[PDB]
Structure 1
């Protein structure tokens, strides 16, 4: 009944829906939240070709805007499962079922957790995974960022608008972030580093975070230091629970595809961050999405 259903309206899914709709495929785009995906949790995007800089939420709106006019059916849905029935597939959300000839899974990735004490307890009260979301709640605080990657370092740099200081704690003595971002963090006077360290415990009073205990990974030296906020950026897990059973994931839960965005199951494609891959960016999400769309068209024509 749908030619294609796209699950997730981040940049991969929005690109795919734009393309399927231009191919006049009957297109359903399901999203649990706000179109834009991780882009909405991104303050400034510098490396999307075609924009010198642009706020994540503005790029989200620009990507969402033509979709209605092209005849994409945009709908709310949290997807809980998918059944392969041979010549059709069924998609299960909280309340609805949808039948379709093909599926493009574009549901992205989610913050990994430290799984340390205080991490859950300080939940609403000092622990965050989203700096553009929570940054202004930490005006004048000493903020701690955990991680060494693009997200830790960029979001640290963002957070310097708010904090007295921002400290990045990384578990080695060299960051993984893009060098241009490293160099910016090195030069920024409000950014400090705790190298070769991992956090062990997050501590506070009944109401909020007050300190972190951490360990040096080369010496075992243990230190406890006062901080008012902790932002955690230690990498990503796939958001693919609704396909656990289907035999299309690796051990860690990422969706495996070939270079044409095809899974095992014909008519089920995956794009963007949910895929088993190493390079997670808006550019490659958009690329994945275009590719899936064209492959889905081929698949449905040949059905």
Structure 2
């Protein structure tokens, strides 16, 4: 049913170690929990090749293997894991609404756990044309570009999957990569007739008229840049900034850009928590992110059950 699929006690945005640990604890509290994860390969832990300082996990382990263990634990105890990119929130009421292309999820408690693989929109025109042709969510905006020209910037798992989303609609998908993509999964993407590869090309500028983007300026390997007509530009370059765009300035931020939280990981908005590297503390380690998620889950259990005290989850 609609209520079964979309209405939860706890909605967690982001499935890195913070979000998965939070879900493990809320699910073990028998709170109906969903993780909305845009791409399990895009988080900081998932891209770590070999993690050797996660306490309790010895030997050689890849980050994406460690994360898979954590995700499987959360699901084992009842978490619903969904591939879904959150692009907006309505935080003004006791029931929070969470907007994805897969539908609107609702939660009595909301957890922001999207990490800090983001970047400031530094390409000239990029900030200027946000919402007017510049986008970071192909599953949300792809359908608006049926039979239109689009540009995808970046070489990483997210860019490849988002480019494939856009091949379902666009007349042409211009893929701008800094290096040779052959370095599958590229093969599958490059097999789409609409994909045009621009290897070793840099995106110089995004331009348009008042109505929105009309072209990009690019420089590929001769002293003179060229203009490429396009109406949608999807940029998937990785950075070190907290991923907070979809929050639309609705929670307080520290001067460093991270989400501000109190001692129980609660943001400035009641019923909304922030955990892991979205907080942009200096202590960017997987076990610290996991600890944040645990604290938030314990605070959420007290809040949703109106308990007098935090209740630890102890084996006896």
* TM interval, short-chain normalised: 0.5 to 0.7
Which has the larger strand fraction? 1
State the match for 2:63 in structure 1.
56
Do structure 1's residue 102 and structure 2's residue 109 form an aligned pair? Answer: yes
Give 1:95 deviation, angstroms. 3.9
Match of 1:302 among 296, 301, 306: 306
Do structure 1's residue 205 and structure 2's residue 212 form an aligned pair? Answer: no
Do structure 1's residue 125 and structure 2's residue 178 form an aligned pair? Answer: yes
Match of 2:52 among 26, 46, 49: 46
Match of 1:13 among 19, 27, 32: 19
State the match for 1:165 in structure 2.
none
What SS is found at the alignment partner of 2:294?
helix
**Number of residue equivalences:** 204
Give the alignment's TM-score, normalised by structure 2.
Answer: 0.58
Question: Over residues 161-210 of structure 1, what are the superposed CA-to-partner deviations in whole Å (9 max), with x where a residue is unaligned?
Answer: xxxxxxxxxxxxxxxxxxxxxxxxxxxxxxxxxxxxxxxxxx9727xxxx
Trace 1:144-293 onto structure 2 (pairs within 5 A): 205=221, 236-293=240-297
Give the alignment's TM-score, normalised by structure 1.
Answer: 0.60
Unmatched 5+ stretches in structure 2: 1-6, 125-152, 156-175, 184-218, 223-236, 308-316
CA contact 1:9–1:35 (8 Å) conserved in 2: no
Unmatched 5+ stretches in structure 1: 128-133, 138-202, 207-231
Q: Rate the CA distance shift 1:22–1:83 in 2: closer, same or farther, 3 A.
A: same
The 10-residue stretch of structure 1 (47-56 or 104-113) with the greater mean CA deviation from structure 2: 104-113
Do structure 1's residue 30 and structure 2's residue 36 form an aligned pair? Answer: yes
State the match for 2:75 in structure 1.
68
Rounded to whole Å, the distance in 2 between the matches of 1:22 and 1:73 is: 13
Rounded to whole Å, the distance in 1 between the matches of 2:11 and 2:121 is: 34
What SS is found at the alignment partner of 2:287?
helix
Superposition CA RMSD, Å: 3.0
Rounded to whole Å, the distance in 2 between the matches of 1:111 and 1:83 is: 22
